[PDB]
Design a protein around this ligand. Sequence first.
Ligand SMILES: [Zn+2]
Lengths: 106, 96, 117, 69, 53
Amino acid sequence: QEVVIHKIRINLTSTKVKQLENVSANIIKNAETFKLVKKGPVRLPTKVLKISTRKTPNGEGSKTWDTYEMRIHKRYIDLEAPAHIVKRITQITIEPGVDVEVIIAA
Amino acid sequence: MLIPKEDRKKIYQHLFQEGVLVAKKDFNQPKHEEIDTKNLFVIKALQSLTSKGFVKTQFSWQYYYYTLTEEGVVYLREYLNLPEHIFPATYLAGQS
Amino acid sequence: IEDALKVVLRTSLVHDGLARGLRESAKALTRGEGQLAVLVESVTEEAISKLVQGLATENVPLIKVADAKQLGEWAGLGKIDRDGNARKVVGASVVVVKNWGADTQEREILLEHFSQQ
Amino acid sequence: KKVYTTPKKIRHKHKKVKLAVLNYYKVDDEGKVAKLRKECPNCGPGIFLANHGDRFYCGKCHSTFATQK
Amino acid sequence: ENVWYSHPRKFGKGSRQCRISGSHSGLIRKYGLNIDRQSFREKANDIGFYKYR
Ligand SMILES: [Zn+2]
């Protein structure tokens, strides 16, 4: 028995979009079932990680460049919710690829 | 390589305790992690140990991957005397 | 006969404390470090032995006796590999024990026989 | 590859210098053991010092110790 | 053991060092990878970089 509202930000990080989407859906479902105050899954400017590299390992040949890129998806959620139960909720359901990060503040 | 004997002994003990040894190809550097000795000596010792069977070796991403066989373990024990039933981690203790 | 000999040597080996030779022995003797010294009664010159004895007198107790090679074999000097010996030959010269290890046996009994009659 | 380089001058390494030693820790004829020369107090009495010529110098803590007399 | 065997290797090519082979040429330090270009080429699909554009 505690019952104290946190007002907490939860940030996700994913290289894979589908997994992230699934996680978001799961979170929304959880919010629905427990009836909690939320700010609906907010997207960010997706950082594209570009590494420009000459494809040639020797240099002898024509000037060929390849920009090996990794598009990284953030997507965060804001939950205005209670304590222990909320914490329990914000731990379960893990998809391979996506990383879930829950911060603090009461 | 000639290593100060006590240091070598310490290294061996550490290995026994672990059942696992690293030490990267980062030569010349002051000190290895966990074991407080110069790395080159350690590496040489490991190589010597390997030479007759005993340990395993992989050079991947300059790391060195040292793990002993049971015969090797026995030999190590003999080298450092040590009474019966002192375990590395090959002998299972936890639950997974 | 003599339980605090081979066993004591083994214990010393385990914990590093066999100051084998002359200089090492002397070092061991100079402070309260060398608990028990084994020398050879039948060696060349004997002046060295006398010196060792003097140093011990300055802990003191000494086990005398001869048989150098046997003592060397007991102590472990060279390459073992198999089970026993596997060397050419090695004597004792002067061995000073700095360790003790496990008690029981004839640890204090030999000492009693020697120092304390 | 370009071959041969000879600017001369060659040496071994260093001698062990064997001897029989132990003239130090000198003995009186059954009674007292005597300490020859000098021995370091900063490292522990018994650890012998080396005498050269207006210098007394340790081996265990080599560059650390120097004494004049 | 020698206290005369190594001078400062602080930057440039010293501490700025490879994390695969032990080379120094062509070191992409972007996002702290420290991988050689060629090696990266044959591995980037596993690290997570692709040929999208
Ligand atoms: Zn000194």
